Design a protein around this ligand. Sequence first.
Ligand SMILES: C[N+](C)(C)CCOP(=O)(O)O
Ligand SMILES: C[N+](C)(C)CCOP(=O)(O)O
Lengths: 132, 132
Amino acid sequence: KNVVIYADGVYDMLHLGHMKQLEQAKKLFENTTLIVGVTSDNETKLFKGQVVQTLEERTETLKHIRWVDEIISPCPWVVTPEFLEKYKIDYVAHDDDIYAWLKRAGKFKATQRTEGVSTTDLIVRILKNYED
Amino acid sequence: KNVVIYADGVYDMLHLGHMKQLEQAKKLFENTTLIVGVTSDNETKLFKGQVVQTLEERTETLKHIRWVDEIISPCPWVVTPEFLEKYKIDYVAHDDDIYAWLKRAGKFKATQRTEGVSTTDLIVRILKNYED
Ligand SMILES: C[N+](C)(C)CCOP(=O)(O)O
Ligand SMILES: C[N+](C)(C)CCOP(=O)(O)O
């Protein structure tokens, strides 16, 4: 039976860390639909910080990712129970409390980040490790 | 009938431009297997220039790309006719002469780059457009 997974995020400058997280969410059960929510520029800036890529750029890259079945772009900043019913979502997948209500309901699936793999760190790599 | 497509490249700091190129190669015919060749650190440096990501890092990202069916990593720097027979490749897909022999044989499929979308340009974006 197919299980609908929802993974929201900014997905700015998508890197191997994001990709492994999406893979993990896609693979939480044998048969899934992975829906990915991409947060708006305005709300990301307002609640998180400056985004490098636009909503359109962040959404267009996700389309090329193997694990992504459906995209909600933009997505709401805060998951609600109405949202879960509206899109028939069985589990919310996110790094790990604003998610307590999901955990209480049995609908939270923790996914893990990967340190050091970010695009930021790859410029930091060529810096210090060259041009001195 | 399934058509085997071979697309080689450095695939350093994979960006939307690479992804659209891979999509294009994957979609050259109705049914394909897209094999992607990832060039070695040594030969890339020797023939092209410094690479940011290692062979392993460049190969691991490609695994997450929807369009990629198989990966040869590392791949030879120069395609040969023996290589085509060894992997049963029907067409080489590459941006557009070292490919004249492929074109002469009917086995070359040009794919297009996309300007401005590169990770280099996205740091250039936040620079000049901020921290002044
Ligand atoms: C924006 N949000 C509150 C829905 C989730 C935060 O997303 P990220 O912090 O995993 O990018
Ligand atoms: C390395 N090569 C000669 C096989 C193809 C060059 O690859 P790219 O220049 O498309 O990255």
